[PDB]
Q: What sequence folds into this?
């Protein structure tokens, strides 16, 4: 189940 | 035994030639089961294994959203890292991400992973405790602060420990006949004269799963050190793997040599002689 | 930025048997960056029905790819793998040693 991701 | 789940995404910038190309692949153990290519026309997370096909429209929507959402953030991360490093917009850069969780024999949590690389080198990673980040450099430290102030950690930790292992448990059950099968290696030896006083012996291991395997050559029961040549374990292309070790042998001495293969799928480790 | 040159393996899926249809593979791995040019050759000729695995990479961030096509070996039919990459001054042609 694909992860959530965040801006750098 | 233990199992894993992993996601691998890679964005590459194509400056002057359009927008970056985002590619993401999903694996349970050594078995891919999903993909998302931004240069594809589906614009959706697609199945790459049989046992994931049985997932409903709800699942495919959710997963499609999260990968598509990622691809977008990444494309803006490539921009941010150009600013961070004062780099030229003329050069092409890569932004990799791996994410996943290891579990034990009965499906308990062992370890969680979420980490990044800019241009092939470590960028930012989540420490084993899923509580803190490690920054590779000064740039990555700006993003370490941002994720600290944002409290990204406590979100990743909850996901990894719960959703991620829960998902892995499920996949392992749906893909049971496959993801838990243990195919032993098909083993055999070859013989190649190189120059009348020397002949290569080559030990083979074929069609096995998982990929973890050990091939050991021996001269009178004495391990050889790199007079032998291993090749990197390679994918057969059908779910199974292959590998071979070789030794150069003084003609007439072939029989002093033994090959030793260890693999999960074996009852006892095999030994081969020419 | 920092570049790795790919390792190359050309081989068949199953133990080659002339007349018996099989699969030829070219495995490129441990390279970086990911832009790569790989061709399967049937007698010096680019094959047109060649597929590949989805871009993936290893623990050290290095990429790997499987290129493959169905084929029936014969006594005379020769097969090679041609690979180009930034790290290569010129295309590298790896011959399929049917019995390596």
A:
């Amino acid at each position: 189940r694909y992860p959530l991701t965040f801006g750098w | 035994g233990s199992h894993s789940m992993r996601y691998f995404s890679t964005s590459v910038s194509r400056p002057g030639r359009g927008e970056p190309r985002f590619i993401a692949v999903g694996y349970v153990d050594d078995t891919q089961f999903v993909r998302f290519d931004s240069d594809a026309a589906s614009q959706r997370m697609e199945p790459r294994a049989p046992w994931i096909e049985q997932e409903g429209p709800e699942y495919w929507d959710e997963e499609t959203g999260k990968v598509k959402a990622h691809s977008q953030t990444d494309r803006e991360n490539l921009r941010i890292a150009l600013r961070y490093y004062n780099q030229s917009e003329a050069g092409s850069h890569t932004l990799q991400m791996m994410f996943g969780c290891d579990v034990g024999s009965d499906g308990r949590f062992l370890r969680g992973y979420h980490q990044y690389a800019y241009d092939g080198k470590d960028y930012i990673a989540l420490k084993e405790d899923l509580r803190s980040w490690t920054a590779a450099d000064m740039a990555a430290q700006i993003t370490k602060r941002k994720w600290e102030a944002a409290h990204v950690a406590e979100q990743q930790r909850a996901y990894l420990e719960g959703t991620c292992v829960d998902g892995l448990r499920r996949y392992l059950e749906n893909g049971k006949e496959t993801l838990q099968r243990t195919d032993p290696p098909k083993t055999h030896m070859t013989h190649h004269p190189i120059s009348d006083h020397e002949a290569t012996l080559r030990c083979w291991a074929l069609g096995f799963y998982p990929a973890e395997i050990t091939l050991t050559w021996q001269r009178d029961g004495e391990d050889q050190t790199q007079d032998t040549e291993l090749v990197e374990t390679r994918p057969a292309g059908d779910g199974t793997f292959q590998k071979w070790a070789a030794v150069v042998v003084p003609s007439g001495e072939e029989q002093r040599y033994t090959c030793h293969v260890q693999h999960e799928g074996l009852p006892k480790p095999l030994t081969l002689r020419w | 930025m920092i570049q790795r040159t790919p390792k190359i393996q050309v081989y068949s899926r199953h133990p080659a048997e002339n007349g018996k249809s099989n699969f030829l593979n070219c495995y490129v791995s441990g390279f970086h960056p990911s832009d790569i040019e790989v061709d399967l050759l049937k007698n010096g000729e680019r094959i047109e029905k060649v597929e590949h695995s989805d871009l993936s990479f290893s623990k050290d961030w290095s990429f790997y790819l499987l290129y493959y096509t169905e084929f029936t070996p014969t006594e005379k039919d020769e097969y090679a793998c041609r690979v180009n990459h930034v790290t290569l001054s010129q295309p590298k042609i790896v011959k399929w040693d049917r019995d390596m």
Chain A has no helices and no strands. Chains A and C do not touch (no CB pair under 8 Å).
